[model samples]
Target: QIPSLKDVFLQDFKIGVALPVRVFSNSMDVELITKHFNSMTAENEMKPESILRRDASGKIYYDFTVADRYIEFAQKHGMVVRGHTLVWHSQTPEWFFKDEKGNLLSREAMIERMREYIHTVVGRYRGKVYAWDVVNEAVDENQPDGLRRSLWYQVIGPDYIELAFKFAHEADPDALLFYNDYNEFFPKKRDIIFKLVKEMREKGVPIHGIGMQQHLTLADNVGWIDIAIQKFKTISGIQIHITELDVSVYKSRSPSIIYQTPPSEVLHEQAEFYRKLFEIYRKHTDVITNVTFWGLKDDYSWLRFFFGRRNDWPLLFDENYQPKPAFWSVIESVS
Candidate 1:
């Protein structure tokens, strides 16, 4: 029998996967998840769009009925849950930023809504969820202030970032609150994220970690991984989470090609990338608290639907729930 990934890194950070209900439905998929990962991230179920609902009677309520299954499964297997994204530019409903009249809500109104939403969501899962992405992908390198003009920023200004962390902490003081973002290895984006988190920390926001959503490709320079980690480590007391990680076979979206066999060379290159990336992650276990893959297997990878539907194989396991070269490389990279 192959050694489980969680056991291989027992002394290091927890291994996790972003799971949708689809993965949980298959017995084989469930077997791999419970055996390999010590943590679970609700891929999209726990997001605002899924959890926040308003009834026709004008009463706002939450529906954790869907999220509860994931949490229950995690608890049954003794796996901790990382609550994803209380605030983000995407995956959030426009109604959160608007009034019933279809006009943008006032700053105070928006802030109140945000606070209530966070409190309700975070408070609901308290002990079940150990960590949360208080805010996600709020930095934009192209912007003058380096903040994405998300509806949250538009309605509540940049302070929405800090308020989110504040509200989540108020709800569950023990939960590790984080600000997560993709393209964190890009120098420009990284500096902005570092700046944003530092400012929040200075204000005594209960922000505890930074999530580097490393959606990479085979051509991505792995050297940047070390540089990015070092820069974030400069922030005193900030933990790290490789929140949504996967290295795609395609370098760019151009020439959307699907390979039935995915040539041996391509697989070898991806395996090398995974090996080197995990090696970097192992080096920073002191700051890196968790490393979660974005998907359970290549067949279920969002890459399959992203950027023109290229069948991108970007996971440790193949369609059949069997370990691939990348899986072996990750296990061997430990020692």
Candidate 2:
């Protein structure tokens, strides 16, 4: 009875998922991810914290043990993978920001680690990993050109961002390199991203796509979101991927979470919101290549743990691996 999401977007673009390791380990859930998604991202396993470790010598010891499982699963299912991250502030080890003596790395030391890290990781998966989130969440929340005040930036400066893309390209000239971030639907952040990539293009850097992680709120403007993506398309003729998408029904204030199931009316509202998001994704197939859901079901959604809520029904599937109203809304037809 299931219509393959891959088949639905058959000639349009790839449908993907940022799958949790727990889900991939379960046979029933593994079947779900493979049947639905043609592309996959390791939700956490590929992050630095997961893969990088320190031996007694304090040298960087990279372990692909867990990451290999995800890659193998994708390969088994004939799915492509987005190598989740080479650089990000969060989830990165504190060792990367400091020396063996526990002091902050110097300007030179910091940049050196970046070159080594980007090349080593991207190089390891040269052919198997089709895309890489070369840098994640680097743009400042406020200014157009403002780079985030990360330790990398504080030491090596914005040249760090440029160098990352450069090193990634050198490692795998064929792989699609991306700079990914969240809340890009906002005009401030969207415009800032455009400026950053614009500069990259002007220098003839090998950057390929932009990943706008739409961990959207119900208050989003679908039309404006579409416009922002198209704006980036015109800027560099670059590919676009809606990296991590999930809509949360939460209180207006911070730490948004609520325990009870949403009322029928509220559920219907979420359905409509999901429908609009997919429709917008469909409408921009030219510039877009992947629209990856953040998780398989509401029960497993990161939104719940993120906001300290009991019930955060995001994503298209429900607790029992059943399709929700939003699923039909996205297919825009009954199976």
Candidate 2, which segments miss by more than 4 Å at Cα? 251-259, 333-335
**Looking at candidate 1, what is the lDDT of residue 85?**
81
On TM-score, the leading prediction is: 1
Clashing pairs in 2: none
Number of clashing pairs per prediction, in order: 0, 0
RMSD of each: 1.1, 1.8
lDDT of each: 0.90, 0.83
**Residue pair clashes in candidate 1:** none
Tens-digit lDDT track of model 1 for 141-224: 988999899898889998898889989999999999999998898999988888888878888989999999999987799899
lDDT of 2: 0.83
The superposed Cα distance between candidate 1 and the true structure at residue 170, in angstroms, equals: 0.4
TM-score of each: 0.97, 0.95
